[PDB]
Design a binder for this molecule. Sequence first.
Ligand SMILES: CO[C@@H]1O[C@H](CO)[C@H](O[C@H]2O[C@H](CO)[C@H](O)[C@H](O)[C@H]2NC(C)=O)[C@H](O)[C@H]1O
Ligand SMILES: CO[C@@H]1O[C@H](CO)[C@H](O[C@H]2O[C@H](CO)[C@H](O)[C@H](O)[C@H]2NC(C)=O)[C@H](O)[C@H]1O
Lengths: 281, 70, 70, 70, 70, 70
Amino acid sequence: REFTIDFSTQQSYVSSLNSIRTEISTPLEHISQGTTSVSVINHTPPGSYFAVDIRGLDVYQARFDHLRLIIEQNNLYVAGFVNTATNTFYRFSDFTHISVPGVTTVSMTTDSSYTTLQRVAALERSGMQISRHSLVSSYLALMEFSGNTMTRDASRAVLRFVTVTAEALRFRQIQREFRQALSETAPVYTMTPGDVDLTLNWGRISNVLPEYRGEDGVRVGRISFNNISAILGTVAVILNCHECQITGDRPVIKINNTLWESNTAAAFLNRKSQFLYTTGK
Amino acid sequence: ADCAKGKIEFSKYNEDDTFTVKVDGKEYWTSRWNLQPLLQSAQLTGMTVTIKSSTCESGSGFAEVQFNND
Amino acid sequence: ADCAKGKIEFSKYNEDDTFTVKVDGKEYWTSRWNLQPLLQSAQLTGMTVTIKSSTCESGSGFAEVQFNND
Amino acid sequence: ADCAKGKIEFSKYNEDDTFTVKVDGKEYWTSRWNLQPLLQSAQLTGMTVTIKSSTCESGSGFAEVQFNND
Amino acid sequence: ADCAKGKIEFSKYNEDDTFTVKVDGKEYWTSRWNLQPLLQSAQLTGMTVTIKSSTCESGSGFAEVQFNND
Amino acid sequence: ADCAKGKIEFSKYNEDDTFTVKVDGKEYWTSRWNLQPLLQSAQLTGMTVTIKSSTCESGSGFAEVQFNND
Ligand SMILES: CO[C@@H]1O[C@H](CO)[C@H](O[C@H]2O[C@H](CO)[C@H](O)[C@H](O)[C@H]2NC(C)=O)[C@H](O)[C@H]1O
Ligand SMILES: CO[C@@H]1O[C@H](CO)[C@H](O[C@H]2O[C@H](CO)[C@H](O)[C@H](O)[C@H]2NC(C)=O)[C@H](O)[C@H]1O
């Protein structure tokens, strides 16, 4: 399956993301308004992927058009990237189960984790700047890249592209904040600690939201949603939980009309008597 | 005996460092400090608690309690 | 007497190991260490707390507090 | 020996300050104070625990328990 | 005075019995064990913490901290 | 030395009252009493923990641990 993400305008970008979402996911019954929902990724076999052709880095121009991302469908993880000019698929070490036909596959030593990528890139995601200019630079880095081991500049490129594709697909918050960078004024998107926290809690959010039945709030670790517009303004696509489970078997507890991830509640309700704790050194 | 079985209706930390719970319309207190977080957790997560004691009169003490998720 | 009833607006750990909460626009502190995590749990979960004390002036101490769910 | 592995079916605070859990249909008690809130939190989230003891009959004591992610 | 305000970026217990938190890009430490569960609970629930001290500086000790849900 | 950095695969309360966690395929124990609820909270929420100790072989002890949000 092949999709285009067109970075030409905010309209083309959002339209691109919405088109992908509609094809690969189904809206939750209880978190959906019009055609804007939290949707659950449709079940697909492991190894299933979709391709994303990157377009419009130079607004409305058939330039910079040789980059394709390979995205594992079940989890929206970026498995690697294709240089369509050289017909080469550079695949992360943790995605040897993703097979792309008709390309030369280069199996990389580098894994796809943010821990690894931030290290190689010498770039932290919290405070990371993304602009149209830096996406063009990212594109050029990936097109120049060769070999089985990620370089600093290739890793910086992947960090930027994963954020504005896969993470934006998952989170309407990131879609909304980043898209401003595509406007004529060409401002810089700066990834916030809150943006980063969302991406780190996607699995946990995915386990909880299907249980939502109009509660006055949702609490998942460090993440809080106070109403339905907060949910919809933040989250677009979740894992199919029917990395959803960390431990235990209870997705949620309703406490004072707020839906809590049970694990979060458990993690502050496991303290003994304070006097006994502090004196027992 | 089983003094009361149900959800905790309220809990209260007392000036004498004891802890009160109301269960099925009756109030009971305990002096065991580790029961304070255990009872507050049960109250918050909607556990059914069974207060057990030799004397089950309202306002009496206890130091045995069963916790059930359901 | 019931000094203040409502949700905890903020809590504060103090340098003398006392613990402050703001309830219904009024601040109260306690020297009872056991209350610290119990008040934090109450704050996190939006419990309605009732501060009980002989002095109800904002800034005064307490060692009795009731915890209620919605 | 690994005596019982599964979710906690109920927990109970006992009058002697020991703490009982029912796992795989068998009751086990512990006098380890620190296990009380750890076991209750495992209970509320449905965490799988493995009770380890010299004897595995219901009514046995334990001082060792593994908290699993199953 | 307010030294730092924000969510906790990480916490760390050190071999020398100090507990470090990073708030608003700055590291502070406390050896008050009372603060360990309070600070970790704040970290895992995304509370906004305000580190307070008479003198605010990097890598300094603290024993006053305000907790807000947000 | 940097021993392990990962999520807690299981935790265990030991007969000698120490507490064990499995991180990155290796088991590490601590006798630091303060760490018990903190480590369980980390396991519950899937926190990345960084264990540091002078030896990193499975079965090594530790007293230094960082709790990360990542
Ligand atoms: C007139 O004395 C006042 O009594 C209040 C309670 O009626 C407050 O004292 C209580 O709270 C203190 C701070 O936690 C401390 O624990 C006292 O021991 C406690 N009093 C009793 C009787 O338990 C207030 O601080 C006093 O000024
Ligand atoms: C002697 O001064 C009193 O100290 C009390 C604590 O021992 C109370 O102060 C605490 O509670 C206040 C509530 O309005 C406020 O939070 C203060 O910041 C806190 N004190 C310290 C040192 O942090 C009492 O209000 C004082 O009168």
